[PDB]
């Protein structure tokens, strides 16, 4: 029963690799897993079948979590076995019942603190290849465990980080606003107190930038994201890293006596403020709003802007060719800009007279207006409405993932401050092992009231 194949998969691992998350498949695989587990316990009480690992080091539970098999994962996490001969195999227990009320216990053996591959760590840190990682956290124990971790200690840390980032952005804004304008950099210091404050702000800004640089580096090293996972998943890390890059380039140009550094700085500044939006994930409504913003950017703007740019460039080339210029609108950039103005409600239908045929010019402009302003923009609004109607629940699930990742990252960072002081659940005696010893587990109690059962 403990035999391993070439890859190291055991019968349990094989069942897990089989499942495709179909209802019939899920029921059949769960039944087969339960039967095999019970039979093995009857045959070999001493041996542990779930502890066995494949060549990759993944247990059946971790394998199901990594592979996206929500049905098998849900079955395992909530497994209950009422057989007196083998109750140790179950993960879910009823501590007591006061009639309508009931108190249950969950195991957390490798949900939270498992040394190598914790299930939570595995789900949050996935690469999106899995079909459904958003719905995985919805199972009963994980959701409540994460919320407990959030309400206990991570919320205050997140709020502190948000406050610090706000301060940093304010310092950067003030320092950039009062930059010197006379001469070339670097600028000589003065005994003026305001100059000392300005220099202090500059130094703090640079320090924050290099800090974000190194944090992005360590994220890349630690998470070893794939190229796709780099493009599709880690948007915030990339944005913060790019902001830091702009700052560092600004420093380089500043000490290289070039004046272009301002450019870099301003971009960084702008992006910084936008990146404040990252902190909307500590709040449910605003986090869901920001998820919606992300989805709209990815889908609707991308499509609309492809088409709009095609049309704009075509009509701009036509208009510029028509123009003779015999002021100076005979430029592609100027004409593209003048036609873009129609989109923000500031279009002049008479922005030049340097042409030989007025009807052609007018016709082209009105075709452009009808195609972009009256059709494409309102069409975009419609599509946004459809998408909003569609992504009500996916946005909440993605927000829950984002918060979970935040929780895990914070909990890792503050190992030194508290390695195991903030540990979830409590150590409780559950029963007796068939060997006769006590059974002590790190359980997570839940209270549930059922009127129907009585």
């Amino acid at each position: 029963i403990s035999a391993r194949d070439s890859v190291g998969n055991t019968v349990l691992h094989a069942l897990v690799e089989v499942a495709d998350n179909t209802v019939d498949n899920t029921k059949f695989v769960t039944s087969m897993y339960n039967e095999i587990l019970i039979l093995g316990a009857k045959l070999h009480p001493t041996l542990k079948l779930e502890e066995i690992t494949n060549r990759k080091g993944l247990t059946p539970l971790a394998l199901a979590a990594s592979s996206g098999k929500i049905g098998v994962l849900a079955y395992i996490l909530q497994r209950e076995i009422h057989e007196p001969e083998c109750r140790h195999l179950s993960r879910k227990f009823t501590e007591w019942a006061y009639g309508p009320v009931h108190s249950s216990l969950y195991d957390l053996s490798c949900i939270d603190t498992c040394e190598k591959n914790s299930v939570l760590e595995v789900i949050a840190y996935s690469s999106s290849e899995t079909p459904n990682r958003h719905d995985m956290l919805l199972v009963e124990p994980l959701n409540r465990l994460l919320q407990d971790k959030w309400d206990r200690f991570v919320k205050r840390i997140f709020y502190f980080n948000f406050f610090v980032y706000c301060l940093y952005m304010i310092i950067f804004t003030a320092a950039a606003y009062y930059r010197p304008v006379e001469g070339l950099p670097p600028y000589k210091l003065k005994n003026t107190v305001g100059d000392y404050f300005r220099v202090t702000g500059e130094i703090l800004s640079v320090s924050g930038g290099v800090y974000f640089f190194f944090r992005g580096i360590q994220y890349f090293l630690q998470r070893r994201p794939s190229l796709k996972s780099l493009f599709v998943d880690s948007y915030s890390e990339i944005l913060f890293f790019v902001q830091s890059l702009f700052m560092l380039v600004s420093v380089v140009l500043y000490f290289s006596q070039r004046k272009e550094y301002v450019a870099s700085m301003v971009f960084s500044l702008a992006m910084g403020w936008t990146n404040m939006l990252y902190y909307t994930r500590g709040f449910q409504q605003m986090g869901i709003y920001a998820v919606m913003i992300e989805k709209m950017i990815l889908r609707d703007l991308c499509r609309f802007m492809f088409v709009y740019l095609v049309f704009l460039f075509g009509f701009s080339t036509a208009v510029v060719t028509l123009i003779e210029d015999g002021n100076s609108y005979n430029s592609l950039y100027s004409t593209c800009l003048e036609l873009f103005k129609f989109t923000i409600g500031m279009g002049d239908l008479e922005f030049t007279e340097n042409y030989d045929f007025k009807a052609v010019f007018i016709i082209l402009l009105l075709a452009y207006v009808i195609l972009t302003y009256i059709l494409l923009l309102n069409m975009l609004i419609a599509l946004m409405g459809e998408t909003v109607n569609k992504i009500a629940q996916e946005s909440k699930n993605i927000w829950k993932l984002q918060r979970a990742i935040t929780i895990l990252d914070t909990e890792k960072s503050f190992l030194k401050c508290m390695r195991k002081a903030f540990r979830s659940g409590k150590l409780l005696q559950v029963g007796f092992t068939p060997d006769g010893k006590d059974d002590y587990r790190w359980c997570f109690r839940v209270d549930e009231v059922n009127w129907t059962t009585w």
Copy 2:
């Protein structure tokens, strides 16, 4: 059966405190209440079990109404007991039936005029802690009772108050429009007739302001609203009070020879006109429209404006920093205003040339335009659509609450004019008490036709 616990709750009070408004819980609690009531009546006909009150003075009916237990409340209000031995316990009666037609009577023992805690008074005057106070008024007797009170006498009073407020606002507008401009206040009177009219208008405006001041004071004293209930529920009272405050401050500044009083006055003026919207609750369609307006303000604008202000401030700081100024757009206020203009369709992409790098400026502006004008605003429209699709019935229920509160407040104010002349239902003989005396109750007849029963 009449025994009381430490808090004073009786078995009925305990059942009421138990209910959570679940279907199974509701059915079980209603059955238990009916069984206990019948058994008690059989055991102790003389004693009254519902009259007993807890330490707080709340009866089971008032307790259910206050706590938001719609199921128990609905059961009690429409209780019918066909047992010949105990029919007095029922609240709903059939006066007669002409075949398809039937005439029923409701009791109104403490629905309307109950001295201490009337159920209507209790529901309307709630603090929103209850899960569902909007659906409570939907029960059969209360809805029809409120509509009868509205159609009988309160509608004319509401219309009169609306007319008077319109006149007041017109007087205030005319008086403010023709204010003196030469010198400092106070302004010396003249024998000109127009000046007498102006002074008359000023005095009437001040009187209205102080009246609203005192009305807000008495509302606060009487309703003793909690801090939350002050923030979340009493928007109109706050708005009228603030308008009065602006007027009073204007008077103070006017007699203090300061010229700033105009500022205060205009704000009051503006708010006054907006507060006219409060009178859309006498009309169903417009009241529901105004409820929708409230909800949109609370949710969609708040979220949108958070995000929009973040983006605007960031890009404004970036643009201002880029600007050198070597007119005078090198100000944060001016740049924020110029960028806000893009939002109302009046943005100039060439509002300054005092910069060293044009590409940076152009890129920043177009990023701002794409992020706010093309994404956020249309996104907002989409979200408004979703919300509208969602709040069709909640808005009607909230309007019904607003009208109910108006009815109760009016009915209280005009006690002197008619303490009990306008009382709902009529005194009718229903049957005979088990003691053999007549049973006289203030009943509210209803007519209902049922073809199925025959």
Copy 3:
């Protein structure tokens, strides 16, 4: 069985007055009507029970049609009685069946040509008091009968009228465009050919105007609409009449040597062109579009414009009061206009500097912008979306009514050209009356294929 009450209602009339269009009520009343009819036919074959009329002259069928009882009407129109003893009472017949195919006949006794109160005439010419007159025409015979009348002869007449109105509007436009400008009216004629054409156009325009005047008069006389039905139902008749009134007033002023006549004329002109939209009811898609336009105007614009005008007037009064003027924006009309400009995307936030406090002015303007431009307009778009989602089928039904009214009016007008040449259905022998004579009826054949029955 033929006895009449004080109002003249017979048992059938009484049943009809009973029905409330509930499913149980409908089934029970239909069953009772059928039983009473069969029993009466058995008792008194010679007498006719449906022919009997109440004091008002309305038969049970016409009474049901007028009162809005769709269930009873549908039962009567499609009544089939397979009893050999009494088959004459049925209105629907099967001429033959070729297996899957079947051919049915409908009676049309008083659906189309009934002298006093034809059912079609009665439904189309209703006053909207009936709960559902839109769904009435959906019954099987009436829909197909109306479509036959449309496809046979009325479509060409409608197209001809549309062409003539287009010509009239073109003549009016051309004549008004080339009006004289030198002096006061009336203008002396000239031998110039263009002047003769201009005068011809003027005369034709006046003739069309007086024609529409008299047509509106005769409509009012004939239809005797109630005050409500005048306000709520006959929009097109009112609009055409008002256009004619403007034209006639223009003539009066023109021969009264006043120059103001132009004003009147232009209004008429404008309304004329808009009234061309009336001819979108000959086409399904455009007719439904125009119905939607009507509904939006009635509901969404009305509500929005109430609120918007309140806000605009309030903020305009505030701004005007703030202004000192020590150009000349110190007018209520100018300020209201400048603030309305914000709504069409042309608002200037710096349209005056004649004030003492800039912060107050700016704050007021931005409050106005946020309340009207960012909330109310987008809110309106959302509400329009909800309404569109709601009125998909009602618009089609209302279009069908509009077309039906057009058909009836046309068919009445052209009695002289063809009194009975264009009559629907054909005279066919159906069977034998119990007296033994032939049964000849004006039937309307239909073909229907049913695979299930076989």
Copy 4:
């Protein structure tokens, strides 16, 4: 059983002509077809009943495909007959089953390569008279066959054509941008290298134009589209042809020494760029987007623009008539343009003062603004939203059709390069004909896993 009627239809053809795609009709016709086929095979094994063709040359399968009978077509393509006596009549086979897995084979006898009327060719090349040609391709074999053809060889060809068209458009743009401006055409050549490049670009542009001209010609000849099918179906072919026409006219005018050629050229240029959108059908998301664009143009813009133009012309005539002009706004074109500006957010409410009555002018303008800007445009947005909600699946199906047509056209064009090298499926032995010989067919294998059957 093989007897033919006057038109040549056999009993199978008659059944096919009978079907109306109703569920009961579909089941009954499929059962009758199967019974007749089995009985005929039992009676006449040697004869082939499906091979028989009507006078038009269409077999029952091709007849069903052409006529739009999706039910019969689906039955035939997936027919399975497990009777040992006659298994040859079936089209769908199970090669093997490994438990949960199964491998099926489809016949492709005349789905792909049938000489005269291939089913795929027939469905793609339809004239839209059929009720549902979009859903036809959804059947199991055709969808997978088309996707295989796409993934195998046509995708690269499509990408190559897209690249070539992009290059052509770039060459045309560059050549047109640098056109000579001094004198009249034709322009004398110069030894300047840039002039040689310009001439090369001109020649290549003309060659592309004449190529598209001839391709449109051959399409018209080959497909022999009907007048309707020309108006309703072949939009892209028409657009490319019109672009070529503009180019050719430009050449004609250029060598005719006329200067107007530029006009033609620019139009062609513009349309060229827009026609790049045709290549969005190689990508699913963008193809569906472009289908939505098409539908919106056809429905919503058409209706909106009818109504909007009516209103604009009416109010423009009114305003122009009011104007006296005693600059020069007394023109219909200028006034129509100024009023259209209100639509793109650039309307001036004070664009002239040459009138005698200001109130009339203001009233007309505000009526126009309210009717077009506040009602019609937002109404349009709402309608777009409804349409988007409605056409989610139809757009995907139409995209699949467009891609299928592209596949077929490409596969026809490259017959010379590979007549039968790229043929779908493979030749496999299926069984034995009743004559005892082998049965070899061009089958298309599919793999399907079913857990329920086991």
